[PDB]
Structure formats: C-alpha cells, structure tokens
Amino acid sequence: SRLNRESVIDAALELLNETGIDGLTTRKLAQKLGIEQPTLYWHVKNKRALLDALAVEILARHHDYSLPAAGESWQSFLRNNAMSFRRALLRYRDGAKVHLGTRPDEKQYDTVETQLRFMTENGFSLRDGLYAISAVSHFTLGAVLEQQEHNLPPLLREALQIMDSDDGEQAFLHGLESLIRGFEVQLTALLQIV
Amino acid sequence: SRLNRESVIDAALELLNETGIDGLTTRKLAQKLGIEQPTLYWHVKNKRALLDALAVEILARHHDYSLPAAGESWQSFLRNNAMSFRRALLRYRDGAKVHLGTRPDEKQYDTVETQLRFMTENGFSLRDGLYAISAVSHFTLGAVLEQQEHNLPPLLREALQIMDSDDGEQAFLHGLESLIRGFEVQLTALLQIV
C-alpha cells in the first residue's frame, strides 16, 4: 500500500527528479510519503540504502538491453548495450551519479558474467573482453555525466554550434563506433604488430 | 600572506583531500585558515567560486600536457593529453567531480581552440575533430570517476582479479588505444564505406 518497496522507490525516483541526488534526504522522502520519519526508517534505514535501491531499479526498469540476443554480433551488442545504458542513466536527474556511487549488486554480477562469457565466445580473451566492456561503460558514463552537469575562439564558434544543436547523442554514437572499431582491429590482430 | 588567492587555494586543495568535495564548506575552510567567516567571505564569496578556482588550478597546476608539441602526431597528442588529464584529475580527492561541476574557463577555451586547430590541420573536420577530443575526455573522465568512487561468477573471478591487481591504468590505456585507432580508420576513411 503506502509503505512498501514499490511506493518507497516510485516516490524516491520522483523525488530524485525534483531535488537531485544531493537534495534527496530521508527527511523529505518521509514528507513526500506523508509519514513520520521513524515509520519510514523502519522501511529504509538511510540514504545509502535508498540510493542503492534506486540504482538497481533505474537499471532493471530502463536498461532493457542489458544482455545480448542469441545470434548477435559483439559489435551490435556493445553498441546497443551502451545506448540502453545511456538512455537508462538519462531517464532520471543525476542518474549517472546515482549509479556511480553504488557498489555493483549481484544482479549486475550475473549480467557482467554473461556479457563476459559472450565476449570470450567471440574470440576475446577475458582480459581484453573485460577491457572492452569497461571502456564502453567508462565512456558512456563520462558522456552522460558531462551531459547531466551541463570573447569566443573562432573554430570553437563552429564546433560549439554542433554541440549546441543536438543533445550529445551524435557525439556519443560517433565515439561509440570509434571505440568498437578499436576493439575490432585488436581482435582481428591476434599475434601481430597491429 | 595568509589571505590571498595563493594560500586560499593551497589550503582548499589540502582541505579537499581531507574531506572530499561534499565535506568542503567555506566554514571549515575559514577554520583551517584560522580566520572569521566574514574575513574569508571577502576573499571567497561562496563554495561555487571556490570550486571554480580549484578546478582551473587543478588543471593548470597538473595537466602539464594540455597543448601539443610542434611535430607531434595527433595520436601521440590525444594519448599524452588523455594521460595528463587523468593523472591531473587523480592528484586530488574527487578531482574529477570538481572538474565535472565547473563551467569551462576561458583558459580552457583557448586550449580547446588550439587542440581543435591541431586536429583540423591533421585532416580532421571540425566536427570529427571535436568528437574525438570529446570522446577522449568523456572516456577519461568516466574512467577516473569510476576509479575515484571505488557467491562470485566464475569468469568474473578471473576478470575481477585483473582489476584488483593494477590500479586501472592498463584498462584505461588499452581503451585509449582502441579509441584513438577508431579515429584513425575514420580519418583514413574519407568518402568510403568504412
């Protein structure tokens, strides 16, 4: 009903959009829900617990492309996986920061495992496959963060105007392709001086 | 002497390491300096002003490879530039977060301009050159952030052990190379279906 995981999180995500990750207090959460702080405490011990639940919920609820489809190329996977992660992180104010601050839940563990098994199955060593998975996450996280926080040099007047027109998807997608291709030339490289 | 840009910043960076970007208050800064809050206020109007000064100072003081060397390849530049940015951001607790939250200073503007002029001079369109500069920054920022904030699946026991041994430099450098190579195949691509 009013106080159970379901509503507590719905209300939390909603509150998150209203005041950001910093303005988010168990105090104001209690008020939004319309209950006394100790009633809330019983269900949510503190902000850390709250954020932890929001992070996994943000992903589960919106990172629909967390795991690959049988018969899909690793390139398509990493690409689609990165887009879904970005969109998921962008759905909520400070989403990226909420993610960044949470220690990976076991839901994420079986997820990474699968993805990693996938990469290895594509001729990727555990090391390089993990590196790839990480480079993609790192780059996606950095892009979303930059995007969520946000006299003139001539060239920049032009460059800037390309950032000021689109919402940063193009630049991300382009960078994404360059990232993926870097892995391609690496995989196909084997024991060569590539 | 005690209250001037010099010391105020030295003390701020030092305080930053002690309590992070969140624990950093003008109140505790005043106390560290040994003065009354209004005395401080005269020199630093607020936390935002403080952070702004710390961001540029963090970069100027430690991002020694901000601009290219005459006769250097764009690959070498982006690589060295990314490493210097990462090291700079890692010098101080929450360095990446301090950077993320600051609107680019004009020092950064002439810097980006130059770098952008460099890329164009290497056959890079303003668009793609900016994309490259951004992908590198985005990825570097994401890596440092992940690094600054931080039952077991079989494969992950191995993968994890490669993260748990090194400090994340290898994974970054590897990802960096894959990023740069993606740009190479793009530049050399021209009007081709690459």
3-state DSSP of chain A: CCCCHHHHHHHHHHHHHHHHHHHCCHHHHHHHHCCCHHHHHHHCCCHHHHHHHHHHHHHHHHCCCCCCCCCCCHHHHHHHHHHHHHHHHHCCCCHHHHHHCCCCCHHHHHHHHHHHHHHHHCCCCHHHHHHHHHHHHHHHHHHHHHHHHCCCCHHHHHHHHHHCCCCCHHHHHHHHHHHHHHHHHHHCCCCCCC
Contact A117 B183 (CB under 8 A): no
Are B1-65 and B66-193 in the same CATH fold? Answer: no
Question: What is B66-193's CATH topology?
Answer: Tetracycline Repressor; domain 2 (1.10.357)
Between CA A37 and CA A44 the distance in angstroms is 10
Measured torsion, CA atoms of residues B193, B119, B85, A146, in degrees rounded to the nearest 10: -60
Residue of B nearest to A151 (CA): B106
Between CA A17 and CA A145 the distance in angstroms is 15
Q: Helix axis angle, B126-149 relative to A126-149, nearest 10°?
A: 100
Half-sphere exposure of B110 (CA within 13 A, CB side): 4
Contact B179 A175 (CB under 8 A): yes
Contact A120 B155 (CB under 8 A): yes
Which one, of A102, A108, A111, A179, lies nearest residue A140 by Cα? Answer: A179
Contact A126 B175 (CB under 8 A): no
Q: How far is B79 from chain A (nearest CA, A)?
A: 14
The domain segmentation of chain B, as residue ranges, is 1-65, 66-193
Half-sphere exposure of B11 (CA within 13 A, CB side): 22
Of A132, A142, A171, the CB nearest to B145: A142
Contact B112 A175 (CB under 8 A): no
What is the residue whose two structure tokens read 């990474």? A112
Furthest-apart CA atoms within chain B: distance in Å: 66
Q: Helix axis angle, A169-187 relative to A126-149, nearest 10°?
A: 170
Residues 6+ away with beta carbon under 8 Å from A76: none
Q: Is residue B174 marked as binding? A: no
**H-state helical runs in B63-125:** 74-90, 95-100, 106-121
> In the CATH hierarchy, which top-level class contains the domain A1-65?
mainly alpha
Mutate to test the interface with A, among B173, B174, B188 (most CBs of A within 10 A): B174
Of A110, A153, A172, the CB nearest to B113: A153
Contact B175 A134 (CB under 8 A): yes
Mutate to test the interface with A, among B130, B148, B184 (most CBs of A within 10 A): B130
DSSP character for B68?
Answer: P
Method: X-ray
Measured in Å, how far apart are chain A's first and last C-alpha atoms?
60
Cα A131 to Cα A106, A124, A171, distances in angstroms = 20, 10, 22
Cβ pairs A/B, distance under 8 A: 169
Count of other CB atoms within 10 angstroms of residue B139:
28
* Annotated resolution, angstroms: 2.2
Q: Is residue B63 marked as binding? A: yes
